[PDB]
């Protein structure tokens, strides 16, 4: 799995306005959701409305 620099010692010590300082990091939260995409997006739990992405 991931190994890469979540500690990130002195990250490259940047300025970090507000929401990039205290907000939640979306990217592990969405790679977990990508990872179980067959069972979080399974076609037959309710079998009514489905919406296909464009392109």
């Amino acid at each position: 799995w991931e190994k890469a620099s979540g500690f990130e010692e002195s990250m490259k010590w940047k300025k970090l306005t507000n929401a990039q300082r205290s907000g939640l990091n979306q990217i592990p939260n969405r790679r977990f959701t990508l990872w179980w995409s067959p069972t979080i997006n399974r076609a037959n739990v309710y079998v009514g409305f489905q919406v296909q992405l464009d392109l």
Partner: protein
């Protein structure tokens, strides 16, 4: 997500500036501060020259920044050696 209780920010923000622009704004801000303090003190000997430095005009002394001028208000009392020029201004008390 708390869309209510997340630390907010506005779109199109451009972000917080780097150290060079921040402390340049600090130097301009401090210039405005010292200018308004000597304006309140109504000091008639503060001069700023052709390159952004400060001069005690009776003193004829140069100063790099603001606190180099307004800490030159205590030493070398020509500030009261204008009593000689006041005696030339008026031959009595």
């Amino acid at each position: 997500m708390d869309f209510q209780h997340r630390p907010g920010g506005k779109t199109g923000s451009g972000g917080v500036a780097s150290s060079s622009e921040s402390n340049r704004d600090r130097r301009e801000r401090l210039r405005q501060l010292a200018l308004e303090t000597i304006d309140i003190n109504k000091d008639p000997y503060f001069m700023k020259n052709h390159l952004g430095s400060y001069e005690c005009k009776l003193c004829l002394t140069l100063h790099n920044n603001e606190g180099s001028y307004l800490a030159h208000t205590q030493g070398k009392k020509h500030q009261t050696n204008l009593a000689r020029r006041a005696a030339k201004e008026a031959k009595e008390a």
